Structure 1
Amino acid sequence: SWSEKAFSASKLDDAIAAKFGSLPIQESTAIQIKAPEIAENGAFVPVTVATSIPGATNISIFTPANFSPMVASFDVLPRMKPEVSLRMRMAKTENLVVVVQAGGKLYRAVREVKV
């Protein structure tokens, strides 16, 4: 498990690098993720992501456990109060990782969904 967490952390960093490049990243409370705290085994979990970060031009959603870690990417003109919804099947307890690009900077937020 600890080993698994280290490997899935490794996957995530590479996938972010693959998408945005080697951009400095920070944690932000200006990213809102709403999902159920717990959900049923193998069920469709509604997830909603928003950000109030002004120059946000991309919202990308990563699930580091799954075989392909990037699950969705949203390009938008800035200053449009974007909010994005999707439903994802979830077979095991996993962290959703949201990365927002604004300016030349990445902002990160994470939320766990126990299954």
Structure 2
Amino acid sequence: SASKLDDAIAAKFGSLPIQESTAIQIKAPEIAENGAFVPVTVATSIPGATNISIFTPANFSPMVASFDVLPRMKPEVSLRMRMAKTENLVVVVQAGGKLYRAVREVKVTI
């Protein structure tokens, strides 16, 4: 669960310190239909950000996307994600030698 997320994060980023951040914005519907494609957008204001990655640690492929960027480009990513079940969207930004994390739950109906 948490171990898996951390393992996934580590493979992307190595062993860098992680801390929660509100300087990462995640937009997704609060609740979603089983099987529906759902719009998800992620962004960050962290000046030195050189990567923003999206994890869905409950899924077979825990990393959904990875956006490498030069610093100061305020990257945003938008995609459509199929919602199987109530899950957490976990977003991580690297800026320098620090990792920043934000988490958002999407509830799924049946």
State the TM-score, normalized to the length of structure 2: 0.96
The alpha carbon displacement at 1:46 in A equals 0.4
Per-residue CA deviations over 1:14-67 (Å, capped at 9, x if unaligned) read 011111111100000100000100111110010000100000010000001001
2: CA distance between counterparts of 1:79 and 1:22? 24
CA RMSD of aligned residues (A): 0.7
The alpha carbon displacement at 1:81 in A equals 1.9
Count how many residue pairs are aligned between Structure 1 and Structure 2.
108
1:59 corresponds to: 52
Unmatched runs of 5 consecutive residues or more in structure 2: none
Per-residue CA deviations over 1:57-97 (Å, capped at 9, x if unaligned) read 10000001001101100001111121110001011110000
Preserved CA contact (<8 Å) 2:52 2:75: no
1: CA distance between counterparts of 2:10 and 2:30? 29
1: CA distance between counterparts of 2:93 and 2:73? 14
2: CA distance between counterparts of 1:90 and 1:110? 16
The alpha carbon displacement at 1:9 in A equals 1.5
Unmatched runs of 5 consecutive residues or more in structure 1: 1-7
State the TM-score, normalized to the length of structure 1: 0.92
Please identify which structure carries the higher helix content: 1
Larger displacement relative to structure 2 (81-90 or 100-109): 81-90
1: CA distance between counterparts of 2:46 and 2:74? 9
